[PDB]
Amino acid sequence: NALKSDFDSLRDQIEKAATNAKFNGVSIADGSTTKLTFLANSDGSGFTVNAKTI
């Protein structure tokens, strides 16, 4: 039971550390969006970077 309590506490710690990983209201690791694209050229071409949910 003690090991189960430690494991559940570590699991909640993982969920909080994953949920809190934001920058300016957008996050690539929480799974809130399929991908983020950043500008790459003056004609509007982007720099696609796929989201990876941790």
Binding site: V26, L36, T37, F38, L39, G44, G46
Partner: protein, 55 residues
């Protein structure tokens, strides 16, 4: 001599046209810099990564 003396109206009319086009060129330089600034502004807003407030 009358045909020769008539030309001063041609000269000052050409000067008035020069001045009008110079005013238009100054305004055009202003609008050109403004159009470039909107180029950069719409480009900065084009990306999907921004939050709504910056948009």
């Amino acid at each position: 001599s009358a045909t020769a003396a008539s030309m001063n109206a041609v000269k000052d009319s050409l000067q008035r046209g020069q001045s009008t086009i110079d005013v238009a060129l100054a305004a055009g330089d202003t609008i050109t810099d403004l159009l470039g600034k909107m180029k950069e502004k719409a480009l900065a807003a084009s990306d999907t990564s921004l939050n709504t407030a910056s948009f």
